[model samples]
Target: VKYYTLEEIQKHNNSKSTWLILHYKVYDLTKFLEEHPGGEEVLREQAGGDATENFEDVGHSTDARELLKTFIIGELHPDDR
Candidate 1:
């Protein structure tokens, strides 16, 4: 598998190239934004940064958490963790 850095993820903050950190994992959220139940605004707010707390606050279902696997790219560099 490939790896990505926080510095690399930060470079893709725009709507067209969104990346997010959740549980120290990285996800490419650009396409997922449209299909999100809560809508794009919430994602837009957390795009390009850590959303671990915000995500936990949502109390997403086990299934919801499972779906996140499809978007998995890499992880936060260990030092960044």
Candidate 2:
């Protein structure tokens, strides 16, 4: 799994793509919002919050931990020396 700081998530928010966030990682999901089955409105409703609620209920094999590996570009830890 990977991690990112709040600042990194904000940067990606300006882009146009499916930026998924891990446990703490934030994603840009701006582009994917339109293509979503539920609709863009639904996506926007949960813009900058924990998406686990929606994802877990989807019944997909892609567990949170596994999905997290797909786009883990960075991480943010308090104790990293």
Candidate 3:
């Protein structure tokens, strides 16, 4: 997979592009926002940060993890990972 640095991901920190790092992988969550059952605020609060902990903390379902993979765009840079 392609790799993205934290800085590059940070540049996309906004409601429109909303990129996040999870397990050091990069995901562009923009498309999924409006459809999220958790609603806009939770993901919006996370936006461009590594939201793995927050997501996991919610005890999201196995289906949710599978759902997240659809947004996977790339891997985080090794240093960032």
Q: Compare the candidates by TM-score and give the number of the best one.
A: 3
Clashing pairs in 1: none
lDDT for each candidate structure: 0.88, 0.52, 0.88
Q: What's the count of clashing pairs in each model shown?
A: 0, 4, 0
Q: Which regions of candidate 3 are displaced past 4 Å? A: none
Candidate 3 C-alpha error for residue 16, in Å: 2.2
Q: lDDT of candidate 2 vs native?
A: 0.52
Q: Model 1 Cα RMSD, Å?
A: 1.1
Q: Which portions of model 1 show Cα errors greater than 4 Å? A: none
Candidate 2 residue 14 Cα shift, in angstroms, is 8.6
Q: Can you rank all candidates by TM-score, best first?
A: 3, 1, 2
lDDT of model 1, residue 69: 93
lDDT tens readout by residue for model 3, 1-81: 799998899877787699988888899999898999999898888887798888888888889889999999998899877
Worst 10 residues of 2 by lDDT: 72-81
The local lDDT score (0 to 100) that residue 78 gets in candidate 1 is: 84
The deviation in Å at residue 38 for candidate 3 is: 0.7
Clashing pairs in 2: 3-74, 3-75, 19-27, 19-28
